[model samples]
Target chain A: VSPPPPIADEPLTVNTGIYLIESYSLDDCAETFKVNAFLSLSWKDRRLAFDPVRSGVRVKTYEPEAIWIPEIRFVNVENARDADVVDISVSPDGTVQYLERFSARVLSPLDFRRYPFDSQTLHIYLIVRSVDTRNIVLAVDLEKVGKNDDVFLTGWDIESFTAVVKPANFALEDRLESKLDYQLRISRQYFSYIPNIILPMLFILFISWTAFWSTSYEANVTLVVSTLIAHIAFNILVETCLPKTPYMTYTGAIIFMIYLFYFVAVIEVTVQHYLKVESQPARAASITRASRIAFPVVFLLANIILAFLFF
Target chain B: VSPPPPIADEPLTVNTGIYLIESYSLDDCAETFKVNAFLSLSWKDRRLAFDPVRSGVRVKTYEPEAIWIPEIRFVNVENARDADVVDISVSPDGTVQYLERFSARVLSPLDFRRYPFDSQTLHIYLIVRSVDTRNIVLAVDLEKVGKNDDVFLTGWDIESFTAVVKPANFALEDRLESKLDYQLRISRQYFSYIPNIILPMLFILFISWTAFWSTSYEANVTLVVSTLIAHIAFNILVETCLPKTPYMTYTGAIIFMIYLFYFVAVIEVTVQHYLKVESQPARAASITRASRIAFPVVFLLANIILAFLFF
Candidate 1:
């Protein structure tokens, strides 16, 4: 393997920003994702500075081979399929503007607890090699980052993007040296998961509560058991689609609530069954009427509590 | 870039096989996956043959730089993160053995219609660069491929693995060039999804029929509607977990069956409610008693039919 890049003594200012996000995708199995985008990476070299009157040239373009540009790479990128220098432009003042189109699949750990309802942050980190803190710094043009509107993801919305420059350090020759790091933070849209995953789970639980209207105790027991099985099936279906995580999500809580309600319904049905067998139909009728109101009211209140706790 | 590997005019036999499968993964979002394994790539290079008495050595190990090895690459790999030459060994006769360890994340288009209850074949292809069928042939040591039991995935079971060598041709420079391709077939285990996704759904539908024992017609209507909502909720929950595919699966068919049964249940409840409202209690009671047996029997029969048709 080649030795690590040498650290430059003088600090360098690297200007970076994203132009367009052609496409974005999340791959759960790989624990990483890919993004196809156009990026603007530029810097200045005083040696190339010239006055327009003396140079007689307004602007000039050169291929990557013709100029010496800072070797900047994405530190967090796992697999960089394409990173070709498409164009490089130089202004009269020696500001070298490099335009690159790349398709990089990087590692970004996902938390899918809320799943479809979950919002994710995609981070892209750019690191400058052969540059140290005293010699170079990084800057991002915030206005140009994530500003495109022509592209749309089917179930996602782009919320906001923020850029930041931080001082990074690495070990060289058994000593620590400073480096420049540029980071991009992207907030993804989460409204799709709410209507598709969350609402349906809540709807099913509410439906289970409606089975309380059954006057026969034994019939109510059957409904409870049926609903319990339904809850398990729903949970299993959701589990298959999500990457394994340690923490439970709001969706998981809702499923748990369904199981709890079904258990309570079963207990209520058994009590009613016992009362009827003991020749207390009037008492059973009273209990059934009370449950008709109490069961649904309690379910709604529990849902509200869950919503507050998780969302 | 280096020129294409030079084609061998004389026929050469390449013996290839997998040593161990370190890890394997599947991704649904990007339609790709990854595999890490050790491979044994060997060939008979008669040009390097030497006698044991002349060389004063029976077997000698050399770095890749000292000898020529076939330029073989994974033709189907999308992103090959690591492919390192760990060792190279040559025997007195002429067998040149090149051992490599690789971690390749490949693109494998998945068909998710059968999904949890589905079986998949994972393919790994190895192709020769410049050799044609007349000049080179490929062979696999089938007995050694996928032979390890140390790796285990939670929701999947490895049923069997088969390796095959096929002749491949590519049109380059206006000529049909031949190449050798090695493919691996892996079958996925699908038992877990049956108990988790299928059985529970059917149980919920069966329990829904028990509401027929209710003493009041309006109560029966409430039960049917509630169960209808429950069925819809289950369907939506399952939908979120599945990738969008045109053709329906056995799971989809069962969900549809629940819809049909719920519709019939709703109509039955409405008829009973109308009969009672018209002061025809006798007619309503008769229908309820018949339905107590009829609804459940028809449901079971329908499930049996579904099992035969799909499973």
Candidate 2:
């Protein structure tokens, strides 16, 4: 054996604020990359500062047909900050000078009609190294306004909600418009294969929900098992898609919550089945009671509280 | 029924922080009270900005029990910007002064020997009052740190971990020290209730893990159902305990993950049961084979990737 060919060195390079080269790998090794960049939306002293590119950002795709088609075509990302065009021209020297007069907000379906577009779009800047090697710049900008800052603007949906203070028209609506967008663009085309995982599992969950009415315990259990299996498979799929963070996603939370609910039902059903073997109606009655009152109360309360907790 | 019995002339007062406020009686509503208060932890800037509070900062507990038994206390709040603290002293004029003198890093717990035992305490000030109340002040100096000031530290854990960062030479060793000695005192008091919630649930999940072994399909289903029910109930309980945030908590994440795993298991079991009822061992065997390989791969991948995406 050729003494395991020497490993090639890939230095940890954090380039242009977006990419991070965490480690190097050869035949017998693997490497890790991390995103260290954070979206800094800051505004004060008549000046605004932010970096459109950040380290540790990721864009994962899960379409098999598009296995090699992991193009970063911007789409409307829900709940995340939207991007605004500054009308700034970039000088050849890499300096971005804002053309203050032409700056405008990119409107989306969810946002107010301040621009021509209706649908939400992720801002994708195509970076092509000749014709073959091409990448994208994914970016969004969010404005952070201080209470004392005078640039905040009003007149939006939240303005009329019960939670709104509206500041009683205090200090005028400054609309500080602090951008809270973070981004990371990578060169690996295979990274986009992470989103399709939930479809099959979601079907499993939906089917499991339908099995709630299965008259036979075996049938119900069978459905539960299927759902459980689907969810587990999906979870594994999820693990391969993203880097570690100390939080949970909405999809993950929903998937996990459903898993636990199915398990709890299975346990109850098992006990009821045993009772039925001893005697039928009594066991049936117990199952009915458990399903009607106990399960309902538990589920209702869970929904109410979890909804509020997530509020 | 009677149009709320004529609205009262007085405006209702509300609590600002995350809370579960309960009005005991109609009288409590009539005699409304606003839970307006601020907890301040100030110390000398020269005392090594990141050390745990050796001489602790004084804070008032108004609704400690009311928020939720073992409420969550977050400190080092980003907006507060006071991630580190050195030394601080208060002037008679109610101004908080950051002392420039460097204090010896007290690595070995707190040696109360140097300072007079009685005078060792670093008192923090808090102002609790009704929103309508005016001219309320402590006899002691009361200076409000500008919320955006670089020196103002927020979050619920600043005081507890201050002393830990005092050592001059910090390396990976500091992390160990941090996880061991430093407890976000207030946050700990809040988190103390977590074990009560976790232990029972742990037993339940373990039971779930064993459900896959049951020989009878009905038995397996029943166990999954009961576990599901229990999980839903517990989900509600846990949900009620947390405040609404944009991000998931450690408790929420753990519970969610467990539920997803259970869901997958139940679904797989159900499919297997169906195959057995039809006497399709060949099909079942194939399913089992696929699941065996696919299960571990998919489930684990999902767990790792989604955990990263969310957390």
Docking quality (DockQ) for each candidate: 0.04, 0.02
Interface RMSD (Cα, Å) for model 2: 18.7
Candidate 1 chain B: worst 10 consecutive residues by lDDT? B1-10
On the 0 to 100 scale, the lDDT of residue B226 in model 2 is 61
Please write out the lDDT profile of model 2 over residues B103-217, one tens digit for every residue.
Answer: 1111111111111111111111111221111111122211321121122122222232112222111211001101111221221123434475566776666666555455466
By DockQ, the best candidate is: 1
| Over 4 Å off, model 2 | A1-311, B1-194, B237-240, B282-311
Q: Write the per-residue lDDT of candidate 1 for residues B1-311, one digit (tens) a residue.
A: 12223255555666777644434455656656666566777776666678989887676667677777766667668864476565576787677777665667777666665555566666667665444333445667665455445343323555555565555656666443335433344444544334333554554565556556555554455556665666566555554345666777666776677788888887777777789889998998798779878887887797688667765
TM-score quality measure for candidate 1: 0.51
> Candidate 1 residues A120-140, lDDT tens each?
676666655332212335567
Q: Grade the docking of candidate 1.
A: incorrect
